[PDB]
């Protein structure tokens, strides 16, 4: 089901997303749909050039070639939505790589909390620099950045999946 990106801290959003096979599986299909689209088209021109293989007496039973040619329209509409799927996959892959580089790292979130504990330890002189606040404000920033990135990755990848 569709989740809520705000109830979950950035630590969990970055954990699921940071660790995985990678987008390499999507691009492996893009280059297979685009390879497939080129063969759906290449075979359409061979079909439309089916005549001429009838030597001389083209005459009699021309119904043979008359019945294979109509499928050249199906090969063009097949080559179309094939190269479209290659674009749908390549879009989601770029949606992932850009969302991963926009997600705050687990190590970043790690180094945030260690700074928050040592501020509690000794903070008297540099206390009008308000480090307690700016260290939490940096967390809520990462909180909202993680929630935003996922909300956008849901739509970016939700529209690449769309197929009328």
């Amino acid at each position: 089901a569709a989740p809520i990106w705000m109830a979950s801290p950035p630590e969990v959003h970055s954990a699921l997303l940071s660790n995985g096979p990678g987008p390499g599986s999507l691009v492996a299909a893009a280059t297979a749909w685009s390879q497939l689209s080129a063969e759906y088209a290449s075979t359409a021109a061979e079909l439309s050039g089916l005549l001429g293989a009838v030597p001389g007496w083209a005459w009699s039973a021309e119904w043979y070639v008359a019945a294979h040619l109509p499928y050249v329209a199906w090969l063009t509409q097949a080559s179309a939505d094939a190269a479209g799927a290659a674009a749908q996959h390549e879009a989601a892959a770029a949606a992932y790589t850009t969302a991963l580089a926009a997600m705050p790292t687990l190590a970043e979130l790690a180094a945030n909390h260690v700074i928050h504990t040592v501020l509690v330890a000794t903070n008297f002189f540099g206390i009008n620099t308000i480090p307690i606040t700016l260290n939490e404000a940096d967390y809520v920033r990462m909180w909202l950045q993680a929630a935003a990135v996922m909300g956008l990755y849901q739509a970016a990848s939700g529209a690449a999946l769309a197929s009328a």
Binding site: M6, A7, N123, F124, G126, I127, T129, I132, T133, E136
Partner: protein
């Protein structure tokens, strides 16, 4: 006369009243992480709030409280609060005429309605999360901050405290009191003023801070210099010298201080 509740209770009120998102100093996030679990809590929260009476028969909320939430979610001039004492307590002081203050002790949000009586009416609420010590006395001195923040960065990286507090414009009468703040039984707070009179909202570059140590309460009021830098005075924790030390901080904001 006021009321307290939990973080999950608080957020549900923002959905019927429509105030929206709480200030993130309170860290009041949404309880559930899926609309599939929504009805479970839409029904469990309205069940718990009628037990306290603030939520009426079906969906009507207490007006004396529905006011206290709208002024907190979207205020006009606020004051972030962040208490520290060995466990953290944090809240906000909102104003919209009326003034409503909230505090969250990591699980319980407690709202309360106050007034704009005088500059002296704010020193209790900024000194209630502390340990409520009496004001100490010592020789006042003002040292640069961006260099003073470098001092605390050494202490936290393994440095001795008695051989550095002398490498300043430190007096002799104030070395005993600044030695008691780097101990166990001590508490402080950081105050950040904010205003929302624009398409955006703004806070202050720096903040006021009071410390209730063993030697006594200590005021730490900053002030702008000529070169854009910040210098902070270390004076006594006078409940009346703080009321002026804060309107100073509010003056840094384009909406100016609250009242003369």
């Amino acid at each position: 006369n006021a009321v307290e509740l939990t973080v999950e209770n608080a957020w549900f009120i923002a959905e019927m009243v429509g105030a929206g998102t709480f200030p993130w100093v309170l860290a009041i996030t949404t309880p559930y992480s899926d609309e599939a679990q929504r009805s479970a809590f839409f029904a469990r929260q309205r069940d718990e709030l009628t037990q306290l009476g603030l939520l009426s028969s079906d969906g009507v909320v207490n007006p004396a409280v529905a006011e206290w939430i709208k002024v907190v979610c979207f205020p006009e001039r606020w004051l972030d609060l962040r208490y520290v004492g060995p466990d953290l307590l944090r809240g906000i002081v909102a104003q919209s005429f009326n003034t409503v203050v909230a505090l969250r002790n990591a699980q319980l949000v407690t709202f309360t309605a106050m007034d704009i009586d005088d500059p002296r009416a704010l020193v209790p609420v900024l000194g209630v999360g502390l340990s409520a010590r009496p004001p100490a006395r010592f020789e006042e001195f003002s040292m640069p901050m961006r260099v003073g923040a470098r001092a605390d960065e050494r202490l936290r990286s393994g440095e001795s405290l008695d051989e550095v507090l002398d490498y300043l414009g430190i007096p002799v009468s104030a070395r005993p009191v600044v030695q008691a703040v780097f101990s166990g039984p001590r508490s402080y707070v950081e105050i950040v003023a904010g205003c929302n009179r624009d398409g955006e909202h703004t806070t202050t570059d720096v903040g006021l801070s009071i410390v209730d140590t063993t030697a006594g309460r200590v005021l730490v009021s900053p002030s702008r210099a000529f070169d854009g830098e910040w210098v902070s005075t270390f004076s006594a924790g006078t409940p009346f010298a703080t009321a002026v030390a804060i309107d100073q901080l509010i003056a840094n904001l384009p909406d100016g201080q609250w009242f003369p």
